[PDB]
Amino acid sequence: IPPIPPVDFAKYGEIEEVPMTRLMQIGATNLHRSWLNVPHVTQFESADITELEAFRVAQKAVAEKAGVKLTVLPLLLKACAYLLKELPDFNSSLAPSGQALIRKKYVHIGFAVDTPDGLLVPVIRNVDQKSLLQLAAEAAELAEKARSKKLGADAMQGACFTISSLGHIGGTAFTPIVNAPEVAILGVSKASMQPVWDGKAFQPRLMLPLSLSYDCRVINGAAAARFTKRLGDLLADIRAILL
Amino acid sequence: IPPIPPVDFAKYGEIEEVPMTRLMQIGATNLHRSWLNVPHVTQFESADITELEAFRVAQKAVAEKAGVKLTVLPLLLKACAYLLKELPDFNSSLAPSGQALIRKKYVHIGFAVDTPDGLLVPVIRNVDQKSLLQLAAEAAELAEKARSKKLGADAMQGACFTISSLGHIGGTAFTPIVNAPEVAILGVSKASMQPVWDGKAFQPRLMLPLSLSYDCRVINGAAAARFTKRLGDLLADIRAILL
Numbered sequence: 001i002p003p004i005p006p007v008d009f010a011k012y013g014e015i016e017e018v019p020m021t022r023l024m025q026i027g028a029t030n031l032h033r034s035w036l037n038v039p040h041v042t043q044f045e046s047a048d049i050t051e052l053e054a055f056r057v058a059q060k061a062v063a064e065k066a067g068v069k070l071t072v073l074p075l076l077l078k079a080c081a082y083l084l085k086e087l088p089d090f091n092s093s094l095a096p097s098g099q100a101l102i103r104k105k106y107v108h109i110g111f112a113v114d115t116p117d118g119l120l121v122p123v124i125r126n127v128d129q130k131s132l133l134q135l136a137a138e139a140a141e142l143a144e145k146a147r148s149k150k151l152g153a154d155a156m157q158g159a160c161f162t163i164s165s166l167g168h169i170g171g172t173a174f175t176p177i178v179n180a181p182e183v184a185i186l187g188v189s190k191a192s193m194q195p196v197w198d199g200k201a202f203q204p205r206l207m208l209p210l211s212l213s214y215d216c217r218v219i220n221g222a223a224a225a226r227f228t229k230r231l232g233d234l235l236a237d238i239r240a241i242l243l
Numbered sequence: 244i245p246p247i248p249p250v251d252f253a254k255y256g257e258i259e260e261v262p263m264t265r266l267m268q269i270g271a272t273n274l275h276r277s278w279l280n281v282p283h284v285t286q287f288e289s290a291d292i293t294e295l296e297a298f299r300v301a302q303k304a305v306a307e308k309a310g311v312k313l314t315v316l317p318l319l320l321k322a323c324a325y326l327l328k329e330l331p332d333f334n335s336s337l338a339p340s341g342q343a344l345i346r347k348k349y350v351h352i353g354f355a356v357d358t359p360d361g362l363l364v365p366v367i368r369n370v371d372q373k374s375l376l377q378l379a380a381e382a383a384e385l386a387e388k389a390r391s392k393k394l395g396a397d398a399m400q401g402a403c404f405t406i407s408s409l410g411h412i413g414g415t416a417f418t419p420i421v422n423a424p425e426v427a428i429l430g431v432s433k434a435s436m437q438p439v440w441d442g443k444a445f446q447p448r449l450m451l452p453l454s455l456s457y458d459c460r461v462i463n464g465a466a467a468a469r470f471t472k473r474l475g476d477l478l479a480d481i482r483a484i485l486l
Binding site for chain 1 (some may be wrong): 302375482486
């Protein structure tokens with residue numbers, strides 16, 4: 001790849017050199033390797049979470065009696081796990097021969113935690129078998145160990161899919177980079193009240209912006225629109241997971 | 244027990260003798276054995292199922308694409324299974340020594356099917372592991388085999404709890420008899436629109452009458468009021484099962 005020409009930045013004013021943590025450099029290398037290896041498309045969608053939000057907030061009591069804080073992430077994890085089982089091409093990697101897909105029969109999902117030293121993505125194993133408060137506890141633990149440098153490399157491995165949630169900071173949508181060898185990543189942004197047509201008038205519904213980046217060698221455009229559509233459907237009524 | 248004095252019924256008019264199917268006689272003996280062995284109390288409650296009903300009816304599409312009819316029974320089964328795990332004394336039997344309870348670590352639930360030849364109670368095994376449409380299919384199959392005399396004795400055994408639903412015929416409530424050695428049975432009657440106080444006015448909510456009979460040697464009055472209260476809570480928002 002043609003390199004970027006060096007510039008003497010000090011010709012234009014005062015500069016200062018700060019160094020990169022090894023964690024940032026590892027991260028830098030991994031993203032650029034994904035970038036050049038995966039042809040990326042982002043599919044955007046927004047889900048109606050008015051009812052999900054009401055549930056979240058009502059179970060604040062239960063969650064606190066169990067010591068966890070029920071946020072939107074355990075709900076996101078549960079729903080993507082159900083869906084990764086319904087649409088198995090999202091739960092696979094491209095074989096090194098380029099001629100086969102390795103479909104995984106397990107569902108472990110990573111989630112982005114941004115710490116001082118860099119971004120870490122802890123992995124929760126067998127998300128499909130854990131409950132909303134179990135996933136809530138685990139997420140919280142892994143996030144804390146990630147911030148406190150106590151996260152052993154074991155827990156950063158063998159994920160099938162990544163969720164990256166920035167809803168707690170802001171933004172309308174973003175285009176995340178697929179953490180290869182996984183084949184998709186779900187970006188989640190800030191929810192806001194939007195007017196939604198009820199067939200007769202605009203009702204305010206709470207809308208969650210979803211941004212699915214995927215590896216289009218493996219997942220074609222229609223399979224991906226169907227994944228964010230099913231996800232939007234499941235988050236609008238999470239009871240559909242029960243059937 | 245003092246016998247009932249024989250009466251010549253033909254002194255008062257014309258009589259006719261029809262006989263009992265062996266199935267009815269078996270049933271007769273089992274109920275009278277339960278009646279004299281179990282001191283019975285019925286706890287009545289009613290659950291708000293307006294939202295449950297809306298869900299049921301929306302998933303009519305899915306249910307039909309899967310060949311099952313989603314009725315209230317799979318929902319009842321799923322919720323009691325969750326609860327039989329939360330409150331394990333309901334999932335046990337009294338040891339023959341009268342001094343111990345055998346707590347079962349499994350959840351199989353029977354449901355009353357009334358056929359021409361008598362009442363049968365098929366058992367669905369490990370209700371706690373099956374989904375709403377799985378339970379829907381299984382219930383339907385067992386009911387059909389029960390009506391067609393093709394139900395092998397294997398499937399009438401080892402239940403932990405019974406549900407008896409008469410909501411499809413009518414009634415406000417009833418007092419079911421515990422099928423000993425189980426320790427409780429849930430009677431379900433007809434749902435109707437009732438006025439329920441919202442703190443300010445009466446709102447129409449769809450109410451399901453629940454009638455829990457139990458063996459009060461094993462389950463005391465407060466444990467039983469708490470079981471129908473948790474059940475009413477779970478049916479008002481079945482998403483609580485997810486956490």
